């Protein structure tokens, strides 16, 4: 018993072919079963034939005879059909409103999440379908991980390197950082966790959470979890106020936070606010300064990743009283300088998925590009707050969508918050990049910030681009451009000061080859997000949708504090780089 995801009409019916078993009202359930392949209907019991060894589960072929359900063949002489009068039978028949179209629900209930159009719909439907879409999608994602073969340690060739035997008749996951495994030790009559791991082509290189002397017969599965049902919306209803509400500004602020005082007042004068902070513009400085501006405010600092919560902790460690802070950790090494798991502390730092049920003066949700509507809903379900501040940058990278293959996901569809920031604009903008040379700031300002991003620094004159397609090879799930690495190696011989550079590419296999040939530290663009280096050498590797994605490119070139060399495949992005062109040797 529950509430029709289309009407809200109370019901005793959930579609049992739908992987999330959403409650459907007599009208909406009926319109659903008749217009799709979904015909299992669940109530107090499941609408299935109770006859001895009968397979009929289709609600349009079933009857309530006695107090059981039967198909045509096995029904008693006295019965009625479960599924007639443009409605399916169940409790609360009389209360039931239905919908003009069930078209959006049907698409969400039945899509396989491989088309961009599936995510576009999930982020433009009614709020209640946004929750059903986010649950349906996360469940589909978690089920897809079970499709992958077990990987087993066949041989231990060295430390940090392994030989893997793969389960037959199941596919193998890509071996990159977006696929975190769990090891397991072979025991008497069961198995125990031995940490979370990542793998990369060698044999395979393994980067584990903890060290071990892991031996043969240890095996790896992408640990999947239970997706809980969602209740709270992606955004609470917006409210604008005429005064600062439920907060009391400090009378003395330091010139270090003075640039944010107007924005801090805007936070206190609406229910939720969006802050777009391009790279190096002071997102975490903003977030911690809010605490100092409203010194009495209880603030929960959340984000999706331990790293993002940790960065907020590292900024708080500088500026806030340590004794007033707590890191929430569920029973991976994260921040260990605050007291642990003290919910009632003034300043709570905690990942979305570990949030306690509590209230707060302000909730700060950082790195919003990386949130899903699933995460947005969970924050609203766990935290009741006077104010919500959503900090991030719809021009940076979203959560990977493992199932997505046909089309690109635009920023307005990353989640509800990113949708607001791309359609109505952000409430607040940090307009001065402090990190990057002016050639990089100007480039991304035009590319993705509608020329609103301003440079603190001068031109470095250490920003270079080279147009070189080279040669692309593919391994199981990545790309390599040896000749592009060749160009970087030749550049390094004529410019050996660049040997302090970090090497960045859109591909782990490109990074693996560059590490061996160049000896630079390597980062995927996706793994460089939030980090900074003096010198960056970027090889585009390919001209794919992945390597040309403007958000990935933005993140790639904004890592550089001083200098950058971009070896480009794509004429388009090459031409948009406001950098000094270099000829090929
Ligand atoms: Zn269904
Ligand atoms: Zn039967
Ligand atoms: Zn309905």
From Swiss-Prot:
Location(s) in or outside the cell: Host endoplasmic reticulum-Golgi intermediate compartment
Residue span(s) of domain (+)RNA virus helicase C-terminal: 431-585
Positions that bind Zn(2+) 13: 49, 54, 71, 74
Domain annotation (+)RNA virus helicase ATP-binding: ranges: 252-430
Domain CV ZBD stretches: 1-112
LRR repeat extents: 223-243
Stated consequence of mutating residue 35 to P: In strain: Omicron/BQ.1.1, Omicron/XBB.1.5, Omicron/EG.5.1
Binding site residues for Zn(2+) 11: 4, 7, 25, 28
Reaction(s) the record says it catalyses: ATP + H2O = ADP + phosphate + H(+)
Variant or mutagenesis effect after changing residue 228 to I: In strain: Omicron/BQ.1.1
Residues reported in the UniProt entry to bind a ribonucleoside 5'-triphosphate: 277-284
Residues involved in Zn(2+) 12 binding: 15, 18, 32, 38
Role this protein plays: Plays a role in viral RNA synthesis. Multi-functional protein with a zinc-binding domain in N-terminus displaying RNA and DNA duplex-unwinding activities with 5' to 3' polarity. Activity of helicase is dependent on magnesium. Binds to host TBK1 and inhibits TBK1 phosphorylation; the interaction with TBK1 decreases IRF3 phosphorylation, which leads to reduced IFN-beta production.
Record's subunit section: Interacts with nsp8 to form the replication-transcription complex (RTC): nsp12, nsp7, two subunits of nsp8, and up to two subunits of nsp13. Interacts with host TBK1; this interaction inhibits TBK1 phosphorylation and decreases by 75% IRF3 phosphorylation, which leads to reduced IFN-beta production.
Protein name: Helicase nsp13
UniProt lineage: Viruses, Riboviria, Orthornavirae, Pisuviricota, Pisoniviricetes
Gene: rep
């Amino acid at each position: 018993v529950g509430a029709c995801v289309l009407c809200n009409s109370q019901t005793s019916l959930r579609c049992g072919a739908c992987i999330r078993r959403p409650f459907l009202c007599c009208k909406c359930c009926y319109d659903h079963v008749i217009s799709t392949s979904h015909k299992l209907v669940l109530s107090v019991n499941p609408y299935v034939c109770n006859a001895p060894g009968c397979d009929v589960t289709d609600v349009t072929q079933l009857y309530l005879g006695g107090m059981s359900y039967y198909c045509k063949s096995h029904k008693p002489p006295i019965s009625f059909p479960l599924c007639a009068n443009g409605q399916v039978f169940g409790l609360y028949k009389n209360t039931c409103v239905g919908s003009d179209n069930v078209t959006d629900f049907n698409a969400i209930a039945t899509c396989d999440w491989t088309n961009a159009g599936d995510y576009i719909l999930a982020n433009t439907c009614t709020e209640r379908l946004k929750l059903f879409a986010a649950e349906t999608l996360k469940a589909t994602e978690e089920t897809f991980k079970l499709s992958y073969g077990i990987a087993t340690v066949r041989e231990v060739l060295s430390d940090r390197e392994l030989h893997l035997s793969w389960e037959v008749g199941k596919p193998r996951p890509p071996l990159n950082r977006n696929y975190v495994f769990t090891g397991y030790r072979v025991t008497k009559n069961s198995k125990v966790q031995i940490g979370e791991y990542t793998f990369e082509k060698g044999a395979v290189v393994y980067r584990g959470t903890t060290t071990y002397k892991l031996n043969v017969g240890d095996y790896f599965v992408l640990t999947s979890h239970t997706v809980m049902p969602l209740s709270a919306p992606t955004l609470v209803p917006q409210e604008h106020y005429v005064r600062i509400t439920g907060l009391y500004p400090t009378l003395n602020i330091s010139d270090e936070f003075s640039s944010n005082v107007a924005n801090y007042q805007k936070v206190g004068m609406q229910k939720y606010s969006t802050l777009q902070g391009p790279p190096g513009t002071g997102k975490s400085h903003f977030a911690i300064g809010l605490a100092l501006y409203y010194p009495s405010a209880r603030i929960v600092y959340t984000a999706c990743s331990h790293a993002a919560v940790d960065a907020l902790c590292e900024k708080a460690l500088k500026y806030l009283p340590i004794d007033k802070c707590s890191r929430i950790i569920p029973a991976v090494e994260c921040f260990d300088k605050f007291k642990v798991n003290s919910t009632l502390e003034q300043y709570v730092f905690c990942t979305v998925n570990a949030l306690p049920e509590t209230t707060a003066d302000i909730v700060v949700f950082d790195e919003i590009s990386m949130a899903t509507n699933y995460d947005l809903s969970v924050v609203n379900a766990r935290l009741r707050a006077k104010h919500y501040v959503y900090i991030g940058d719809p021009a940076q990278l979203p959560a990977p969508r493992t199932l997505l293959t046909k089309g690109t996901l635009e920023p307005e569809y990353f989640n509800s918050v990113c949708r607001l920031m791309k359609t109505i604009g952000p409430d607040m903008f940090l307009g001065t990049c402090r990190r990057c040379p002016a050639e990089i700031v100007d480039t991304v300002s035009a590319l993705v910030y509608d020329n609103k991003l301003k440079a603190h620094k001068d031109k470095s004159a250490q920003c270079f681009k080279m147009f070189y397609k080279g040669v692309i090879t593919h391994d199981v799930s990545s790309a390599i451009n040896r000749p592009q690495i060749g160009v970087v190696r030749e550049f390094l011989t004529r410019n050996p000061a660049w040997r302090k550079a970090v090497f960045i590419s859109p591909y782990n296999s490109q990074n693996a080859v560059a590490s061996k040939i160049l000896g630079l530290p390597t980062q995927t663009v996706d793994s460089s997000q939030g980090s900074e280096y003096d010198y960056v050498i970027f090889t585009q590797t390919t001209e794919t949708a992945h390597s040309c994605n403007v958000n990935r490119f933005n993140v790639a070139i904004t890592r550089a504090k001083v200098g950058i060399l971009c070896i480009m495949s794509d004429r388009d992005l090459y031409d948009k780089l406001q950098f000094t062109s270099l000829e090929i040797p």
